[PDB]
C-alpha cells in the first residue's frame, strides 16, 4: 500500500494577508490557507519504522526558513536596513496528491524505530519556525514523561534533544547601555524540571551521576542562548540555568545577562552581516522553553559519570524537534 518517499510538500497557514509581518507576508504566497476540519485517520493494525534523523521534511522546512531570513531581514552590509514586524507564525507542511503523512502516537517514542499507534494526518500541526540555540522555544510539548531524542547516544558526537513534558517560561526584555537586555525565568520551577531531567537521563545513563556545565567553547551563538525577539538578536549567558547545587537549598528567581547584537554569524549562507541600531522602545518576548539541546562530554567513558553542556546551532535539529513523529510516504 505504500513505500517511503520524499516530495516537495506544500505549506499551509493561517497567515493574514495584509498584516505586514515577515512570516505572514512570506506565507500569503508560497503557502495555502488552512483547513478548518483536517482529519486524522487511525490506521488498522499498523506499525511503521520511523526515523526523525533521516526525514526530508526537515530539509524542506530548513530551506524554507532560509528563503525567509535573507529577504525579510535585509543585512546592514548597505543594501538598506528597512526594519519590519517579526513574530513567527505556525506553518503546517502537507502532502500533495498521492502521498500521505504517517503520524506517530507513542507519547514516549524516541523518533526512531517502530511505532504501532500510527495514524494518517493530512498535515503537521502548526509549527513555528523559531530559530534558536541551547533552548527550543515556544514549540510543542512531550505528552507523557520527558523524551531524550538522539541519533545514537553512545556517540558523544551527537546532539541531544530533550522534549520537556512541562513548560516553564522565559520573559526576555530590553528597556528604553542601548544594548543591555535580560531574560527572566522562575528558578523554583525551572530547577524542578531539569532535576526531573537528570532523573530521566539517569534512566538512559546507567544511574550514572549527571552534571551540567557551560559550553566548553565555540562561537557565541552556541555558547549562549541566541534567539530572535521582534527582529533583534539576543545572546544570553545561561550559566545560571545549568547550575547544579541550586536544585539542596538554593534560591527563587533567575535573571540572565543577554546582550542585543548588531554584528553576528550567519546561518543561512556562510559569512557575516551587521544590522542597524535597534528601536529604543521596549522589547519583550515571553517564551516557553519546550525543550533543550545539549551535547555530552562523554570523552571519559567511564569516569563514573557523564557530563552535558548546552548546544544547538544545527537548526535542522530545531525542526527534527517537532517533525520527529511525522514521515512521508507514497501510495499506489
Amino acid at each position, epitope marked *: 500500500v505504500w513505500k517511503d518517499a520524499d516530495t516537495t510538500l506544500f*505549506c499551509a497557514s493561517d497567515a493574514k494577508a495584509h498584516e505586514t509581518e515577515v512570516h505572514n507576508v512570506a506565507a500569503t*504566497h508560497a503557502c495555502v490557507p488552512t483547513d478548518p476540519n483536517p482529519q486524522e485517520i487511525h490506521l488498522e493494525n499498523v506499525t511503521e519504522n520511523f526515523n526523525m534523523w533521516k526525514n526530508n521534511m526537515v530539509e524542506q522546512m530548513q530551506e524554507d526558513v532560509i528563503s525567509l531570513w535573507d529577504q525579510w531581514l535585509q543585512p546592514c552590509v548597505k543594501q538598506a536596513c528597512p526594519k519590519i514586524s517579526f513574530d513567527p507564525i505556525p506553518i503546517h507542511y502537507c502532502t500533495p496528491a498521492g502521498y500521505v503523512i504517517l503520524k506517530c502516537n507513542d507519547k514516549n517514542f524516541n523518533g526512531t524505530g517502530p511505532c504501532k499507534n500510527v495514524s494518517s494526518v493530512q498535515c503537521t500541526h502548526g509549527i513555528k519556525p523559531v530559530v534558536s540555540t541551547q533552548l527550543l522555544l515556544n514549540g510543542s510539548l512531550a505528552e507523557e514523561e520527558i523524551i531524550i531524542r538522539s541519533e545514537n547516544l553512545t556517540n558523544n558526537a551527537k546532539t541531544i534533544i530533550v522534549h520537556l513534558n512541562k513548560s516553564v517560561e522565559i520573559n526576555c526584555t530590553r528597556p528604553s547601555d542601548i544594548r543591555k537586555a535580560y531574560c527572566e525565568i522562575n528558578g523554583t520551577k525551572w530547577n524542578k524540571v531539569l532535576k526531573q531531567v537528570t532523573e530521566k537521563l539517569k534512566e538512559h545513563f546507567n544511574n550514572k551521576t549527571i552534571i551540567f556545565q557551560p559550553p566548553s567553547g565555540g562561537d557565541l551563538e552556541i555558547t549562549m542562548h541566541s534567539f530572535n525577539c521582534r527582529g533583534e538578536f539576543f545572546y544570553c549567558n545561561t550559566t545560571q540555568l545549568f547550575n547544579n547545587t541550586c536544585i539542596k537549598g538554593c534560591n527563587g528567581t533567575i535573571t540572565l545577562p543577554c546582550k542585543i547584537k548588531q554584528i553576528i554569524n550567519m546561518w543561512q549562507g556562510t559569512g557575516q552581516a551587521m544590522y542597524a541600531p535597534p528601536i529604543d522602545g521596549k522589547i519583550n518576548c515571553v517564551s516557553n522553553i519546550t525543550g533543550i539541546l545539549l551535547t555530552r562530554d562523554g570523552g571519559a567513558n567511564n569516569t563514573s559519570n557523564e557530563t552535558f553542556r548546552p548546544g544547538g546551532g544545527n537548526i535542522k535539529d530545531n525542526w527534527r524537534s517537532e517533525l520527529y513523529k511525522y514521515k512521508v510516504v507514497q501510495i499506489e
Partner: antibody
Amino acid sequence: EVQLVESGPGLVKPSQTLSLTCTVSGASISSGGYFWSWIRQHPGKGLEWIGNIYYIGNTYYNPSLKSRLTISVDTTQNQFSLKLTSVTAADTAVYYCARVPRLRGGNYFDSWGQGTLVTVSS
Amino acid sequence: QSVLTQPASVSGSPGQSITISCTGTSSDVGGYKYVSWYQQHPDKAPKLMIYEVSNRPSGVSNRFSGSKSGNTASLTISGLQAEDEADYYCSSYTSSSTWVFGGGTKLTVLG
C-alpha cells in the same frame, strides 16, 4: 492524469451574464496544495487573467474585473465555475481552464484546457 | 496589476539564438521567483515552457532557458528551428495577490 475541460454557453447577450465550468478529472480538486484558475484571451489579442479559487472558500481575482466577477466550487466540490456580469463585446474571448500551483513556491499555470470560445453579441 | 512589457516581436535565423524580455515592477518580476513562460502556436492553448523564473517542466525542449535580473526576465531559445515561430507570454505573480501577463511576442523565423 489531470485533465481540464471547459463547458457552458458560447453566446452571451450584452448586459447578460456569462457562465462556464471547469470539470477537473484526473483530479482531485481538494487534494493539494493547488489552485484553480480562470483566464481569458480575446481573439488575436493577448492573455488576461481573471481569477483563482482554492478548494476551500478563498478566491483570488483580477482587480480590473472584481466588480463583475465570482468564482465558486460546486458538485462534490469537483468542478469550479465562472460568473461574469454586465458583459459587453469586450469580453469576447477564448476562456481557459487551468491549474497552478503553489507547492512550496512556484506560481505558474499548467494543465491547460483547450478552451471554450464565447461570443458576446445580441 | 501593471501589465508587463515585452517586445512586440523578435526575430532570428535558424540555428541562431534570441532572447525575449519581460519587464514588470519590483512587485511583479521584482519581486518573487514566480515568473513563467508560455508558448502558443496557432491555434492551440498556451503551453507551460518555463516556471519559477527559470525552471523547465519535463517534455519541454532543451533550448528554452529562463533568467532574471532586476525587474526584467528573459526567455532564451538556443538553437532556433523554424517551428518555434509562435507567441510567447511572460507572466508573474504579484502582490496585490494576483497574476499579470506580458503583452506577448510574435517571434518570427527569418530566412
